[PDB]
Amino acid sequence: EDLALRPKTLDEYIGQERLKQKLRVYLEAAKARKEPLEHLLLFGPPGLGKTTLAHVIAHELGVNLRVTSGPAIPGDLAAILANSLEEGDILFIDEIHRLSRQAEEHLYPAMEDFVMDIVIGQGPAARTIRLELPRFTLIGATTRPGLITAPLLSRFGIVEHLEYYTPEELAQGVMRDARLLGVRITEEAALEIGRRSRGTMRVAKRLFRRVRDFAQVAGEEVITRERALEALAALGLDELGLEKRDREILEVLILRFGGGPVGLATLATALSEDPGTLEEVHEPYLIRQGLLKRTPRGRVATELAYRHLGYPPP
Amino acid sequence: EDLALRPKTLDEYIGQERLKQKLRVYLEAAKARKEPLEHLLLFGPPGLGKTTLAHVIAHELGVNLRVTSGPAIPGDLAAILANSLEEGDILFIDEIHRLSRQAEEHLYPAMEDFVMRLELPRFTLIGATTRPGLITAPLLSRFGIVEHLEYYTPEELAQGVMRDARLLGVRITEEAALEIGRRSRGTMRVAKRLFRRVRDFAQVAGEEVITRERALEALAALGLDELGLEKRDREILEVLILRFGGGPVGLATLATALSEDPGTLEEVHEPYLIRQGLLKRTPRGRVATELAYRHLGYPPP
Amino acid sequence: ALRPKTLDEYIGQERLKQKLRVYLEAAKARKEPLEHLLLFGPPGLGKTTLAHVIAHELGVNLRVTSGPAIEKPGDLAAILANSLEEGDILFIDEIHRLSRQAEEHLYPAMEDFVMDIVIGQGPAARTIRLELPRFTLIGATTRPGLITAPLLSRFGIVEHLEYYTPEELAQGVMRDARLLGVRITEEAALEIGRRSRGTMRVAKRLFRRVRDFAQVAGEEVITRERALEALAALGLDELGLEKRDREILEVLILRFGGGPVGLATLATALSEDPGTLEEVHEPYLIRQGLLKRTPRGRVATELAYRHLGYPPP
Amino acid sequence: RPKTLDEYIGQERLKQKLRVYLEAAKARKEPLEHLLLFGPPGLGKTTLAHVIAHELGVNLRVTSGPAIPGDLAAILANSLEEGDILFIDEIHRLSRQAEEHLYPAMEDFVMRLELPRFTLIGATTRPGLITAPLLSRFGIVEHLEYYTPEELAQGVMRDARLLGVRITEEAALEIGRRSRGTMRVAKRLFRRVRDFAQVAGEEVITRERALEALAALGLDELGLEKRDREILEVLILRFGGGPVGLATLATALSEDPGTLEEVHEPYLIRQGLLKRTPRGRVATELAYRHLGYPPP
Amino acid sequence: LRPKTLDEYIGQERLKQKLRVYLEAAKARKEPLEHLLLFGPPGLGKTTLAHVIAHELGVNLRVTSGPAIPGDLAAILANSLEEGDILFIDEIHRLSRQAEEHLYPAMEDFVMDIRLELPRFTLIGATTRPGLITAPLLSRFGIVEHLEYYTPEELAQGVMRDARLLGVRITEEAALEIGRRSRGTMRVAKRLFRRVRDFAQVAGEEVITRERALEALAALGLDELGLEKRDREILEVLILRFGGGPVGLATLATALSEDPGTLEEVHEPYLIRQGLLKRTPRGRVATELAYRHLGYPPP
Amino acid sequence: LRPKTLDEYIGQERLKQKLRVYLEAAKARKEPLEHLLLFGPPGLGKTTLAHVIAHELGVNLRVTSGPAIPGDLAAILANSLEEGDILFIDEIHRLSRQAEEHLYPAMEDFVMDRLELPRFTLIGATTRPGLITAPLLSRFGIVEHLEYYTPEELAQGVMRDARLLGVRITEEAALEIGRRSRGTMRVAKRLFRRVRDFAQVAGEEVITRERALEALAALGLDELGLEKRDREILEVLILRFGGGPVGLATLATALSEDPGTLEEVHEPYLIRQGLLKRTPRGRVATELAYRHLGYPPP
DNA sequence: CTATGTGTTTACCAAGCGCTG
DNA sequence: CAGCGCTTGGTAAACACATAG
Ligand SMILES: Nc1ncnc2c1ncn2[C@@H]1O[C@H](COP(=O)(O)OP(=O)(O)OP(O)(O)=S)[C@@H](O)[C@H]1O
Ligand SMILES: Nc1ncnc2c1ncn2[C@@H]1O[C@H](COP(=O)(O)OP(=O)(O)OP(O)(O)=S)[C@@H](O)[C@H]1O
Ligand SMILES: Nc1ncnc2c1ncn2[C@@H]1O[C@H](COP(=O)(O)OP(=O)(O)OP(O)(O)=S)[C@@H](O)[C@H]1O
Ligand SMILES: Nc1ncnc2c1ncn2[C@@H]1O[C@H](COP(=O)(O)OP(=O)(O)O)[C@@H](O)[C@H]1O
Ligand SMILES: Nc1ncnc2c1ncn2[C@@H]1O[C@H](COP(=O)(O)OP(=O)(O)O)[C@@H](O)[C@H]1O
Ligand SMILES: Nc1ncnc2c1ncn2[C@@H]1O[C@H](COP(=O)(O)OP(=O)(O)O)[C@@H](O)[C@H]1O
Ligand SMILES: [Mg+2]
Ligand SMILES: [Mg+2]
Ligand SMILES: [Mg+2]
Ligand SMILES: [Mg+2]
């Protein structure tokens, strides 16, 4: 079937309560005035639901949605904007940061004023025209808003940030995915899967799929809490969703170096790992959970790491 | 229908007083001797009123305005100059820094001497850009007037908010507009956007007059401080003060601790904190000042 | 070299094979394509071989490409649209060398199985969505930190290839000898595995060189002594230490007393730039427990004393 | 529009040698050898070429590098007389295919038509972009230097006479003091002061009116605008005058880093007010003294 | 002048011991030799070694350059290469990242891209240091070997062979001196022999005697250690101006009036090899050999 | 005009002896000379040396330039080369990364791809040995370096120029012209033809020493040969930076110059004459500029 | 083939802590 | 207590890559 089952309605959207509270007001005001929405920008870490929110907003407004990509697209964008746009329709550009700095400058006369500067003609007959565009809506989703030019960031009426989820919302997502796929999972098992998900919906769905694989191979029919725990232990995840490599890093830091300041290169060599791989894959979540610190003298293991690994704090 | 409610007169232009005095002197002098105005260049941070000022100047001079763009244009600019330009009219090129380095070489010889050999008429060029550094020095040296747009005081932003409310049909109070002006970041576009969001909140709530209290409620719902700081901007200072002691941190460590891209944390969030004096860029890293400490209700270091 | 085609023929990744077996069995049971899979680890461990073995176990075709081989997004679009089939596998070796624009075309392809391209070349330009078949993407890389995070989050299965023990390298050497007709013994295979640095490719190369040395001498069986003398001729310690590592340890022990020396002082005593001692020689000395990094400096471990035949500290 | 070497305003040191060279060329009845002129933009190199052309007594053919690779042959074989002068502005931008087509016609006189003899005057602002053969094929190399307040005052007086405006010598001198050693800047400032005085309604631009108009423009005695003073103030007061860096300084000034590097910085340098350290930008003691701040 | 047998090769005895083993085993198995990589300083005989290897196997040779190659590597691989033939690529580290990735399919699976079935062949690369090539490249070479600096006796033997092949009479001591002045390099020794022959020919003599060889070598400005006059000047401005302490970057060009160029790449390596310079962490220090060699009284 | 034999060549001793030996031996055994590489600062007369070598060898010349070269190497080595012909190349260090690799096969075994080539003596010329790759440097059998000229050699060169022109410069004045020359023959010739114009306009036929000194002073040259540009550089440094260390980013900007010719054509002479120092943190006036420019020491 | 403009990576270079005898 | 490491941050300068020409 489909492994990227996206909600169609803002009610099926799960856990962006603070964002949804303002989004409902904006959508209601726009629909009451019989006017298209303001240009909208969504940003945040991967896997939180920007691409799903774009489609949910398009369905809520009732308008047609045209989907484009940043890397897909300077002179082309003029043709797409002139030919493929209708009145009140939404144009969605994923990875809008990938637009070249030259291609974004064509959107300046098109987002605030609904016109476009086009030079039409050959040789001495060349002239300039202002091609009027229908009033539309632009939605952009990106992880790097700082790669967008300032005059373009200034033209977005609404800018919103996608925040992390809670274990209960991740459990709700797991339950919805199980119901749509056809797998019977208990609420406690879904909560256990959610607690090991790193506040991300894609991670929760992937973990549920792996647990389903384990249960199906084992011949089970209902993914009970204890069966889910056994499958997660087979996957090698702690109660914080901490893999074996992260636990190895913490153990090496606590034991071999005494938990004190070390540095990236020394710890990487002690772990037989590439320093960049470590600092870009394993370190960020250890920092987020409070199990690691980047002091000016080097990496330090906190008391949370000592209490989680079962060692006596110093 | 229209949200960029551009004024058409220099009297309706709000608050560029220091620039407006010189502009009035230049325009009156040019009109008195029946000669076209000198070539003019406007630059400054986004949202300050360069295009609006260009249109206002065109209206004040009483001549026609031909609007084009830098990205929209070497063999074209010659045709536009030789065919579409009347005598005494204005050619406005927006984002003029994007002009080709060959199309720029075909422009300044026609700007100094009005010959292309086609005898061009007397015309004035207006250029508006955010990056005058991309303009070649030969082209940059032919501009008779070069001006810089400055930020707006909260009272001028309040005047702009009241004008937008009057034109749209919304009823707002002067004290209500003062809060929106204070929370605006010295920019007119930001003030208009904040007024529109407060208007949406008030219309949904059913209120007919946006008093000061209702405006404050809407602004709190938007998540804005008295300094115009969003939640994402307050999180930076909170993480800096609490998780790092306020001392030097660095871009990479701060970005990792905030689950943020370093580039956006450096170019979208930090400039306004630095402008307000709530952040410092020490060579050892980023440091939270005493203003950031007492703004968030923390005891001084 | 001689690549196995069965997961039982694959030699020495047991914790990885335990996870992979249930994934493959469940994917085949549902008659569905496998998830996008990423293999990362140090070179020479068998990532390409594992990709081929996975393709054989699933029973589908395998289209092999490379990171630098895809210069433009048009190549990736053509491969994904024309060269692929439902359930097939596209293996991209060195996937961290893809350009960022080429990595960002893979997001819809891996998640939604669609693709965004622009066609028209001027005033007739337009955007279309190419609908892709349900395929499987396998990526092999040695630098997972060079992969963009949205791309790294789109992999259903992420696995790590670990170093082989001397016994598994001996098993690989014996398999290679049996396939090549040579009659090596258990002890010689164990010695060749110990001389290796936990890598299968190094073990195979050392076996080939020892085979040449034994063949020119007229011997029909590669006895342990012949392997020992051939490996001594190749210039390896009992731990596979080259002469440069030996003399680095000797300079650390004799000249500085084995105590903290520092990177700059040790490098200038060895006439080496501090970008070759740290990245080419230090990691293996630390791996074997012969070198120790301390805030004061670099310290030679007692194991380095016992290995070099020096009096204990 | 000067015609002779006496009408030229303020290149005295160069003019003394140029007069001798032209006199010798006339006495020998032989055309002058090739001449290369260096100098910052805005100093009047093309005007000097015209003056030389008139003084020698021959015609001038003004050309540039990016003016179109085979057109050089048509130029050199279609519009040259005996002893003619051919002027190429921006000679370092000449294409390579054209670059190895001119020096055969410089020394050997052979590249159509056989060129009898002529002289080439080349003007450029970037000597580093001229290859060694091109620099070695020029007989005379000369440098254009910046003007002085008195020479710029003379230029301002000439412009006022051309435009029908009346100025005193003191006002013209004050305008020329604030010019950045350039004639173009002096003319622009004179036009702005003319606008101010005409709007005021004064028949003669006295020194006091010129000073008032230049204060209304926001100019120091050094010619620094408000933005340059703001850059110095931000550098000194907010960063202690120490190294900062282009990005941090641009963020503090709310300015494009490229604009700050290319428009404002070059005049803060060349005046002793700024340095470009590998660790950032440092304000010198001259910046402290100019702004009325205590020494570091 | 190029030899054609490993016996005729002069002085790579340690490398030749293993090369004979690998070569004989490959010949006995009647299969192409594995890919080979040659390290070492320039001028030691890598191309001559490739020619000797090709003649020993009996197969032909297809010498190629590094920066010579994208669309021509496949052409030379398919057309000129029969069953296993040495394709020598000098300066393999200079390949662009366009044909480097096309080598691995041909090196391992012996097919390149339509897809063409390339025949079996052996590739011989050559660089100066292991670090000049990327790690993926230093993985498909079965044999990795290093060339060593020649001793004065081997250089003298090469000079004598060149003299015999040319028709010039030289005493053993003169050739030994010429080899001693050479920096352990065959091309340098051959060049010095040619210069000495040029100097001794105008004198009209028939035998290149040791004294004439020393006079000719002194004419070009070479001491007993083969140092150029620039190296002697550097040593002089080191000792007689600093006493053996750090030289300092500011004062390096004061006595040279030159950019910080060749001093960082042409002078220091040979001085360190000869032991005249030591890179003490405080700074560059001249050893006792520098003091004694420059005609100074012992300390 | 241009010297033909080595005796007519002015100065450049310690290089005309080795060259004499090599050319005599090459004549004796009758085969083309080995490939030669010439080093030295520009203006020392490398092309003249190539012409003298070709004339003494009794063969032709094929002077070309580096950045003029692709199959044009085959064209110029095919029809324009007789056996044992010199093919002097100027600025050989600026060869393209494509045609350079075709020079080696023409240099070892005299075959270029496909027709074979005769034996030819290629002569190169470049400023710095660091600009030419080691594989190319290894291809030249003979490598020599040109040195500067003493004031007497420049004086006699100026005398030869006067003889070819018709001027009667005295020995004591040509000596001063050579002294103010920066050890370069081209600079000496340029100064002589400037003094010629100055004396012609002054109304004189024989140029004594005092007249030459006055003409050189009016041209803008001091006793050390410094022009107005170098003195201006020193003045700007000393005044606007107190003689302190300044890198080649602020000094070039303050002089309205570029980081190009500056430190390439202007400053090397300043360091050579002990007027500038390349400090790790910048550039210093070395306290001799203060004495030369009449300023109090720091 | 060339040229600019942009995004990404990297090599000094300086500062701040902790130890040793 | 004042050299000797180690660790980190930022700043300028290269590289590589794309579009128009
Ligand atoms: N609030 C939500 N409710 C239900 N499913 C969700 C929600 N948010 C995300 N998902 C699902 O999580 C998966 C990933 O969501 P995406 O919207 O693709 O994340 P993303 O923000 O687009 O990540 P990128 O790589 O930055 S585009 C999809 O299968 C979605 O259906
Ligand atoms: N003085 C003013 N009075 C009223 N509205 C103004 C004024 N200045 C600016 N605005 C408004 O500010 C908004 C944006 O400013 P613009 O006039 O478009 O110039 P600009 O924003 O500086 O150009 P860019 O794209 O940001 S570089 C428009 O909606 C204008 O109406
Ligand atoms: N020294 C001068 N004396 C008299 N008139 C001058 C002088 N310099 C310039 N002019 C006048 O300036 C005009 C010529 O402009 P220039 O300054 O020569 O422009 P330019 O030399 O090409 O410099 P750029 O790089 O184009 S700004 C003519 O009207 C000249 O009369
Ligand atoms: N488990 C294994 N069993 C047998 N041979 C192996 C095994 N792992 C690796 N090899 C051999 O080692 C070599 C490793 O190279 P390869 O797997 O192609 O790529 P990588 O070196 O990136 O893993 C292969 O030639 C393969 O034949
Ligand atoms: N052992 C040797 N015996 C004879 N000649 C040698 C020897 N080693 C090197 N040479 C000479 O060196 C020349 C090329 O060697 P070298 O410069 O090392 O190769 P490359 O130029 O490929 O680096 C050959 O002409 C050869 O005559
Ligand atoms: N020693 C010399 N004797 C006579 N003339 C010389 C001498 N050296 C140089 N010249 C003159 O200089 C000219 C060559 O100068 P140039 O080409 O600038 O030097 P280079 O070839 O080193 O760049 C010749 O015309 C020649 O007349
Ligand atoms: Mg994205
Ligand atoms: Mg702009
Ligand atoms: Mg110019
Ligand atoms: Mg791989």
Author numbering:
A (entry chain B): 2 to 74, 77 to 317
B (entry chain C): 2 to 74, 77 to 119, 133 to 317
C (entry chain A): 5 to 317
D (entry chain D): 7 to 74, 77 to 119, 133 to 317
E (entry chain F): 6 to 74, 77 to 120, 132 to 317
F (entry chain E): 6 to 74, 77 to 120, 133 to 317
Authors' account:
In bacteria, RuvA, RuvB, and RuvC are involved in processing the HJ. RuvA was shown to assemble into a tetramer for recognizing the HJ core and recruits RuvB. As a motor protein, RuvB can bind the dsDNA part of the HJ and promote the movement of HJ, known as branch migration. RuvB belongs to the AAA+ (ATPase associated with various cellular activities) family, which includes many members involved in numerous physiological processes.
Six RuvB protomers assemble into an asymmetric ring-like hexamer with a 3.0-3.4 nm-wide central pore that accommodates duplex DNA. Strikingly, each protomer (A to F) in the RuvB hexamer adopted a unique conformation. Among the six protomers of the RuvB hexamer, four protomers (A, B, C, and D) assemble into a ‘spiral staircase’ for coordinating dsDNA while the other two protomers (E and F) close the spiral staircase without interacting with DNA substrate. Specifically, three conserved arginine residues R297, R300, and R302 in the RuvB CTD form a motif known as an arginine finger to interact with the negatively charged DNA backbone. R101 next to the Walker B motif and R104 in the β6-β7 loop, two highly conserved residues across species, engaged the backbone of one strand of the dsDNA. Notably, we also noticed that in both DNA-engagement sites, the DNA-interacting arginine residues from protomers B and C are closer to the phosphate backbone than those from protomers A and D, suggesting that protomers B and C engage with DNA more tightly than protomers A and D. In addition, the DNA-engaged arginine residues form a repeated binding pattern along one strand of dsDNA separated by the distance of two nucleotides (about 7 Å), suggesting that the DNA substrate migrates about 7 Å at each step catalyzed by RuvB. Protomers B, C, and D bind ATP molecules while protomers A, F, and E coordinate ADP molecules. Notably, protomer A, located at the top of the staircase, might contain either ADP or ATP with higher occupancy for ADP since ADP can be nicely fitted into the density with a sigma value of 1.8, while ATP can also be nicely placed into the density when we raised the sigma value to 2.5. This observation suggested that ATP hydrolysis occurs at the top of the staircase between protomers A and F. After ATP hydrolysis, the ADP molecules remain associated with RuvB at positions F and E. The ADP to ATP exchange may occur at the position of protomer D as the nucleotide density in protomer D is very poor, likely due to the low occupancy of nucleotides at this position. Therefore, the asymmetric assembly of the RuvB hexamer determines the 6:4 stoichiometry between RuvB and RuvA in the HJ complex.
